[PDB]
Design a protein around this ligand. Structure first.
Ligand code: VRV
Length: 273
């Protein structure tokens, strides 16, 4: 009984893959997010420990659910005749990176460092759990304004992590790597690092670097905003044309610009309060 436990609220947003509403767990007033996904649009299905057919999204979210709240947590889920309904945790107040950057424009490096670092910890968490996000971007990152913690959301274009090549992709095009645009082939980690490269640029310049396929395959990076030399370096490194030339997650976090990151709470007190 879904409608009995939760109290549906306002429409937080929707797209090709879902409609999301703001609900509250009638049980304890817990704030949650209710995501509706139509069975038709669902492309990938999995099963997880049970042998129960469910959309890959549910599989992935279950594999990454844990104490670590660097990634959104699935509280429960229900299946319906023509759709699946997911109950996600919902922080409040909260704002997504896209809206936040859309209001403050380019972010101070110090803040971008904290945020970027947090995203990296989350993505590492996922890979570690055998999950590849495939759609890392400002829109899929939530900001818990009080604790200054970011959360990865929307594993709708995700997939189990593997070492062999990927031939499918349904994530955001402007965040996809050169190798996808050209050969429609890519490898998880390297493809991820490339989008992390687009994300960082996005944070420090206030907008993405590439808009057209040509710009992506060319990979020439121009900075529209004053950006430190160190940050520019890490950015160009993540956006290297050749996949194998991109940094490992370990190399990114050991990069000079990534040092002395602020604690989440400090970040909130200085940049969010
Ligand atoms: N797709 C998607 C998704 C969202 C979305 C983003 C932009 C526009 C419309 C919907 C939001 C969420 C989402 C939002 C909150 Br406050 C809390 C938990 C969530 O899990 N999940 C998605 O999986």
């Amino acid at each position: 009984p879904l409608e009995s436990q939760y109290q549906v609220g306002p429409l937080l947003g929707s797209g090709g893959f879902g409609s999301v509403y703001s609900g509250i767990r009638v049980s304890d007033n817990l704030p949650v997010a209710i995501k509706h996904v139509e069975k038709d649009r669902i492309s990938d299905w999995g099963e997880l420990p049970n042998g129960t057919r469910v959309p890959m999204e549910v599989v992935l979210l279950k594999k990454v659910s844990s104490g670590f709240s660097g990634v959104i947590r699935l509280l429960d889920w229900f299946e319906r005749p023509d759709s699946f309904v997911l109950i996600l945790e919902r922080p409040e107040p909260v704002q997504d990176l896209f809206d936040f950057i859309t209001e403050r424009g380019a972010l101070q490096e110090e803040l971008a460092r904290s945020f970027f670092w947090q995203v990296l910890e989350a993505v590492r968490h996922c890979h570690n759990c055998g999950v590849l996000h495939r759609d890392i971007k400002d829109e899929n990152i939530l900001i818990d304004l009080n604790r200054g913690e970011l959360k990865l959301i929307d594993f709708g274009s995700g997939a189990l992590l593997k070492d062999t090549v990927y031939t499918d992709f349904d994530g955001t095009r402007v965040y996809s790597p050169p190798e996808w645009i050209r050969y429609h082939r890519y490898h998880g980690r390297s493809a991820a690092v490339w989008s992390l490269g687009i994300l960082l640029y996005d944070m420090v310049c206030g907008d993405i670097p590439f808009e057209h396929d040509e710009e992506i395959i060319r990979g020439q990076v121009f900075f529209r905003q004053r950006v430190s030399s160190e940050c520019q370096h890490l950015i160009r490194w993540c956006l290297a044309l050749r996949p194998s030339d991109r940094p490992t997650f370990e190399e990114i976090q050991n990069h000079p610009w990534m040092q002395d990151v602020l604690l989440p709470q400090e970040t909130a007190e200085i940049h969010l309060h």
